[PDB]
Amino acid sequence: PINEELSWRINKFVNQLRISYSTLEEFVDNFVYELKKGLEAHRKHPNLWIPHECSFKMLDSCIANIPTGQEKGTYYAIDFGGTNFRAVRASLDGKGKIKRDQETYSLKFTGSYSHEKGLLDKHATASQLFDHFAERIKYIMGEFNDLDNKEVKSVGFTFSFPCTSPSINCSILIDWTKGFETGRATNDPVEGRDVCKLMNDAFVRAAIPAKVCCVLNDAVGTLMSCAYQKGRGTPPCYIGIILGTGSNGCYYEPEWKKYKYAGKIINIEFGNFDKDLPTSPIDLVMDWYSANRSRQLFEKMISGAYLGEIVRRFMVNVLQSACSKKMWISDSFNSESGSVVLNDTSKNFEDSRKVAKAAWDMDFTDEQIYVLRKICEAVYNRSAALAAGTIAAIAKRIKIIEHSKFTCGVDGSLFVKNAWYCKRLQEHLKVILADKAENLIIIPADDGSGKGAAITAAVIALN
Ligand SMILES: OC[C@H]1O[C@H](O)[C@H](O)[C@@H](O)[C@@H]1O
């Protein structure tokens, strides 16, 4: 039970974050419309993204051979998913089974102090990033005695960024997202260059006996892994969703041949959606402070690289002068801390006080811990609601041609590391799909980004 001047603030600011069922429907409609415009735009100029024609990049994956579940072998993969970089080793057993061995390192915290924060810096060169990839592949390879010999090892590469892929072995970086600016201020950029080559050169510098044989977006990797692990009689995987540091999805487009595609699976790049976004003033501020102003706008509303900060800025606006100096500090509250508050089962809300004291140095009153709950609910629900609409809209585009039972695989910290979020996304998704809700099967695909690169390396072997 709370002061009235506070509650008026609570009611006002949560209302900027509400999403009614009618508007969410318009979203699904606007999304589906934007999808066809992307397909038609791709038919006209398949090699070029003309953004005024469509916010979606609708990029060809060059994948036409879906996994059969029988792909066999052991392959290395490198999973470049964003702020963290993860190197993997995976063996395939010939049935839908995967053993996986993984080592997650960080790009922000390289161990240097130049370049402000990270290998993301405009002043970091391209060569450093790809060398660091080879450096960690070297270490994982030496550990397994696979490295020392002189016969070349093939490697799958998931590059979680919008790329133009003229082939499965060719991928040109279009635009950095998720806060990266690597090479933009140097003579050695990543943007506009073949990432397959840049990596193969990183192998060459370190004498590593490896070669990248495929480059794929992390969303498509999730789909590939699901298809491989697809049980007999279990419907096929036609959608891959990543809901994590960034937010994006791939899907199976039946008209792939018609609209001049080489693969069947399209990387939508829906993070860059810009039509009728239900923005709040904090959303304008977040975009303004970004390194990619006016791009990835939808992602800046719903992605996990951004939820904690949205909560914080809303938090400051509601409690007003009761906030500690650290409450005003940018990026004091990450999205993981929001997961704790939403998924708190302690009695005295003990766990929720800890994240508040840990981030802000405030022994939260019972009043203020109530506020942190509601502000976390209002923000996170907006992400889940729009995310469900996104899935449904993708489902509607497929079902327009192909209506049946099929499954959609979901990956990323926001979905597998947050029970509350996973509940809301599925709840909203059940509402939008209406009667057909039973037709879409949501299945978690943990580490689909990393497995899928390896499975793709296998399918190349199979031809
Ligand atoms: O990390 C998941 C998503 O985040 C960003 O939007 C990337 O541009 C996109 O390629 C990726 O699929």
Author numbering: 24 to 486
Article passage:
PfHK is the first and simultaneously rate-limiting enzyme of glycolysis, catalyzing the phosphorylation of glucose to glucose-6-phosphate (G6P). ATP provides the phosphoryl group and the reaction requires divalent cations, usually Mg2+. The overall fold of each monomer is similar to that of other hexokinases and consists of two domains: a small domain comprising residues E94-L239 and a large domain comprising residues M1-Q93 and N240-P490, with the active site located between both domains.
In this study, we present the first PfHK structure in a closed-state conformation complexed with glucose. The crystals belonged to space group P3121 and contained two monomers within the asymmetric unit. The active site of both monomers contained a glucose molecule and, in one monomer, a citrate molecule was additionally bound. The citrate interacts with conserved residues from both domains: G104, N107, R109, T268, and S436, which are typically involved in ADP/ATP binding. In subunit B, the P-insert occupied the ATP-binding site via interactions with the large domain, thus inhibiting ATP binding and causing the C-loop and P-insert to adopt a pre- or post-catalytic conformation. The P-insert is rearranged in our structure upon citrate binding and probably also upon ATP binding. This movement is responsible for the loss of multiple contacts between the small and large domains in monomer A. Of particular importance appears to be the interaction between the P-insert residues L130-S135 (small domain) and region P304-Y312 (large domain), which, in turn, is part of the AB interface.
